[PDB]
Each structure stands twice: as C-alpha cells, then as structure tokens.
Design a binder for this molecule. Structure first.
Ligand SMILES: CO[C@H]1O[C@H](CO)[C@@H](O)[C@H](O[C@H]2O[C@H](CO)[C@@H](O)[C@H](O)[C@@H]2O)[C@@H]1O
Ligand SMILES: OC[C@H]1O[C@H](O)[C@@H](O)[C@@H](O)[C@@H]1O
Ligand SMILES: [Ca+2]
Ligand SMILES: [Ca+2]
Ligand SMILES: [Mn+2]
Ligand SMILES: [Mn+2]
Lengths: 240, 240
C-alpha cells in the first residue's frame, strides 16, 4: 500500500499484529519491553522489542517516491535505583530484523558488540532515549542523559541533553519530511518541558524499500522498566 | 490497534502485505483474481482471493466497542462471452480463512457446496457482484445480474438489480456504522449510474473479534477477468 496508519491508544493483552522479541510482553494495557519480576519490579540483563507485523513501504525506486512518516508515542521509565539503564528506542529496520547476539545493555538491543559503531555493517535508524552513559561501558555516549538520532551506529549522529524523570510519561513526536529530508524529534513532559533534535538524512541510502517499525529497550547491570503506553503511526508515499 | 488504515491507489507487482490464495496475482498494476492466459484472456475453472495481512479488530467484547469501517474500491470485468461468470466479492472472514474445497463457480470461492446455504456452518459477510444466474445451477439467485449482501450463506439476505458493463470500472463504497448497525453499499459507473443497497446486521453475532478483509472471485464453465484496480480501507473501534 502507498499509505498505512495504525493506532494503539492502549495495549490490551489481545494482540494479533505485534511481533514480540526477547522479553517484551503486554502487562496492564501497556507493553513492558524489559523483564520485570512478580511484584512488577525491573530486573537486570534483559532485552525486549516489538515490531508491527505489516511492512511499511518507505520508498519506491521505480516511482522515485519517498514516504513521509510520523510516529507518536509515549513511555515512562521507573526504577527503585536512581541511575536506571539503559533506555528505550524507536527504530526502523529491514523486515527480518532480530535481536543481535550480545546487543544487551548500552547497545539497546539494536547493535552487535563487534559492529555497533560500523556504519557500513548496519541498516537502522533509531531515536534513542538514553539514560545511562558511564564512559567505561558506553564510551560512545556524551556524559549526560540524552535523546539521540542513530543512523547505522550506536554513536548518535546528533544528540540533545535530556532529563530522566522517574515514573513520568514522555510524549514523543517523530516525523520525517521527504521533501526536506529532515527527521525531527519533539519530546515533552506533561508540564510543558520540551526537547528537540533533528537531522537531515536520505533514508533511501540507508534502508531498503520495505521496512518494519517498532521499539527496543534493554537493561544491563543497571535497570529500569521501559513501559510503552501508546503509539500511532502513519506513512504516505510522496513525490518530492 | 483500535484503528487501522491502508490505501492501494494501484497494485505494483512488489507486494509484501497481501496474502494471495488460489490463482490470484498482480498483473499490470492490478490484481487479477481469476486466472488468465498469456494473452490476458480469462479461462474457465479458476478461483482466487487476496487478504490484507494485518488482522482487523472488528469488535471488542470486554470493551463493548464495535468498529466503524469503510472500504472503497474499483474493479472491472471483461469477457468475449455473452455470459461472463461468476462474479467478484468483498468479504470479511476469520483470520485463518482459506479457499473451501469445491467452492468454485457460483460459490465464488467463499462457500463449500455442502454448507453453502447453512448459515450456522459459516462465518462470513460479503458484498457480491454476481453476473451469472442460470436458474439451473445457481438456483439460489434471482433471475438477473445483481449486487448482493451475503451473511453466512451464498443465498443473499438481500439483492438489487445490477447492470454488468464489460470493461468498465465500477466504483464501490462499503461502510458499516456500529450505531445503526447498518451495512451500506453504494456503487457507481463513471456515467453516474448508481446502485444502492443497505442491511442491518450486528457483526458481533456473526464474526469473531479479529478478522481479515479481502476479495474473492471465481469462474466455472463461463469466465471473465475479475480485475481489482484500487482499494482503500479504514476502521476504528467506537463505543456503542
Ligand atoms: C556497575 O555497572 C557498571 O560498571 C560495570 C563494571 O565496569 C559494567 O560492567 C556495567 O556495564 C553493564 O551495565 C550497563 C548498565 O546497565 C550497560 O550500559 C553495559 O552495556 C553493561 O551491560 C556498568 O557500566
Ligand atoms: O461458471 C458458470 C457456472 O459453471 C458451472 O455450471 C458451475 O461451476 C456453476 O457453479 C457456475 O455458476
Ligand atoms: Ca548509553
Ligand atoms: Ca451467481
Ligand atoms: Mn546514547
Ligand atoms: Mn448471487
């Protein structure tokens, strides 16, 4: 299809169009990307991802068209600790994507350790919300929590300082304009605190014509719950 | 998802979200539901269907919500014969639906001969554009080409006279309003000729909560091409 839209105001346990990978599962009408114990507390060493089953037509070579897209979603992070890890990310990747071996912790379940920073070895665009930046393990991160745009690498091509607020929902709007090639990210807390970061990228030279969209989250030795609360997505092929 | 939408202004051969069954296949940017020779001429004894891969949430029990959906589409039929058969249908069925054994010809690839008229044996709602009505074989049909609403039976719960126009595209809009439980059908030819038929049905008592939507067509001894040219669909769960 030239256009596709779907909306999850909430996440009932009765799902048919979601691909669950790793420890991701539905709980309390929300998607718990990372594993939690009996009483609902986050645990260490866990990775989880979900992908919408239907493939998205990002660009069409024959017609020379590129899709414009918009992903709106909200999530919250909670942890008994203070410095919870590792973060949640919205990503777009080839349809057959799976969790890479050893992609836990700071790799957010998106990259393989050996190729995490090799751009020519990956096919992924992700918008990460990174809460852990210890320079001993996450050498690629600036030293402060942040939102980043990742293009084939765990080392963001662009970042903005971000504030982690335990148990507070973050509203996010991600949009890609094929006419200007800008991928814009707008994130805001209920009180109006706003964060913005954008980057110009030609998706055609990064991803195949058909892709899949979803979320990924992980917790290494440090942990926190990565709760996806709602999600709407729409894509339309356009001639620029 | 509570809401789902997709649009096929045309059907390029590169498809990822369509489930092809029987002889259905993409040709010249359109879906040829029934088999055609190398010259593009229709042949006898053929059945084909397509379904959108993503499942539609028609209604939700624990929520008392029912979907409001719309399906807009256009198709054309051609045959050198004076009595092209058998017809094309838009249908809604359980996710695992497949072509019933011996469902060709007048059964349009939707019903099995043994239970074609046993409403308690089927789970399907379809809008048929029936062009073959020989009273000796299709005993269940009125004596003329027609548009019919089928609810668990090949014997339409309602029909209205329709005119078959070789090689001319018919534009159809099928909508369901959960408040009035009205399934409305509006079809038009490019010259303004219009056909309408409506029927009150509670989909909850006929179909499961999750379903797949698509088209079916067949040709027995008489044949014709059943070409699906475009299709857009949208559905949203509403309170009732
Ligand atoms: C106390 O944990 C920190 O220090 C350890 C000793 O160097 C590291 O092994 C540890 O790294 C792991 O956990 C973090 C946080 O969950 C994660 O980002 C990293 O990829 C490892 O899984 C952490 O730095
Ligand atoms: O194709 C016209 C006609 O052909 C045969 O008689 C049978 O397959 C019927 O079901 C069908 O209606
Ligand atoms: Ca990090
Ligand atoms: Ca008939
Ligand atoms: Mn980072
Ligand atoms: Mn009929």
């Amino acid at each position: 299809q030239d256009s596709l839209s779907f909306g999850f105001p909430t996440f009932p346990s009765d799902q048919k169009n979601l691909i669950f990978q790793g420890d991701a599962q539905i709980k309390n009408n929300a998607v718990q990307l990372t594993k939690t114990d009996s009483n609902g507390n986050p645990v260490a060493s866990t990775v989880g991802r979900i992908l919408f089953s239907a493939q998205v037509h990002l660009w069409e070579k024959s017609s020379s068209r590129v899709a414009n897209f918009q992903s709106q979603f909200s999530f919250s992070l909670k942890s008994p600790l203070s410095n919870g890890a590792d973060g949640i990310a919205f990503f777009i990747a080839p349809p057959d994507t799976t969790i890479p071996s050893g992609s836990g912790g700071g790799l957010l379940g998106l990259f393989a350790p050996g190729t995490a920073q090799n751009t020519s070895a990956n096919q992924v665009i992700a918008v990460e919300f990174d809460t852990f930046y210890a320079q001993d393990s996450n050498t690629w991160d600036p030293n402060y929590p942040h939102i980043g745009i990742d293009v084939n690498s765990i080392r963001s091509v662009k970042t903005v300082k971000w504030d982690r607020r335990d148990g507070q929902s973050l509203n996010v709007l991600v949009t890609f304009n094929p006419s200007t090639r800008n991928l814009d990210v707008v994130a805001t807390y209920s009180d109006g605190t706003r964060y913005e970061v954008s980057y110009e990228v030609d998706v055609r030279s990064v991803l195949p014509e058909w892709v899949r969209v979803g979320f990924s989250a992980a917790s290494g030795e440090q942990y926190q719950t990565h709760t996806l609360e709602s999600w709407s997505f729409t894509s339309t092929l356009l001639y620029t």
